């Protein structure tokens, strides 16, 4: 997206500055940015609010009521493994993660290659049928770029 930073990050002399946007018969993607939750409190992943209870509750509620509208797989990305585990621990502490569990299966990506592979395989086989599943991972992980979520997956 920024065509002015790559030519200066590395010594480069571009002559193109060209971008292309795909078009189809219908809008295939619906990006949207969710700000404050139902409590009118920001859900920003701020460092000073990582341990805040309100933001974790809002994240859990969003993942719950979102899991009941989009079927067969949702791929969620967190900032880091520490934040991801601290969030899922808080969700388990409250009686909220069970509501997400009874809708979709929860699979956690770890650093183990074999464990990650088997988790991905079971997530795929659960999304093949109508059970549906949630794949929680990190943006800066080997699973972010190692797989492609083709249609009907995520």
């Amino acid at each position: 997206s920024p065509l002015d930073i790559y030519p200066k990050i590395l010594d480069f002399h571009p002559v193109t500055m060209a971008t292309f946007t795909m078009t189809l018969a219908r809008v295939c993607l619906c990006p949207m940015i969710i700000g404050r939750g139902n409590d009118q409190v920001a859900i920003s992943s701020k460092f000073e609010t990582r341990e805040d209870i309100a933001v974790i509750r809002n994240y859990g509620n969003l993942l719950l009521e979102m899991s009941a509208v989009v079927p067969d797989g949702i791929v969620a990305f967190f900032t880091s493994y520490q934040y991801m585990e601290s969030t899922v621990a808080s969700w388990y502490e409250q009686g909220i993660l069970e509501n997400i569990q009874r809708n979709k299966l929860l699979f956690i990506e770890t650093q183990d290659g074999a464990e990650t592979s088997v988790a991905l395989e079971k997530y795929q086989e659960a999304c093949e049928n109508g059970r549906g599943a949630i794949l929680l991972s990190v943006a800066r992980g080997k699973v972010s770029e190692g797989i492609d979520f083709v249609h009907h997956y995520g």
Partner: peptide, 11 residues
């Protein structure tokens, strides 16, 4: 509902 519980394989 978008989710179904299958006691066995459905395919």
């Amino acid at each position: 509902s978008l989710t179904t519980c299958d006691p066995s394989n459905i395919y």
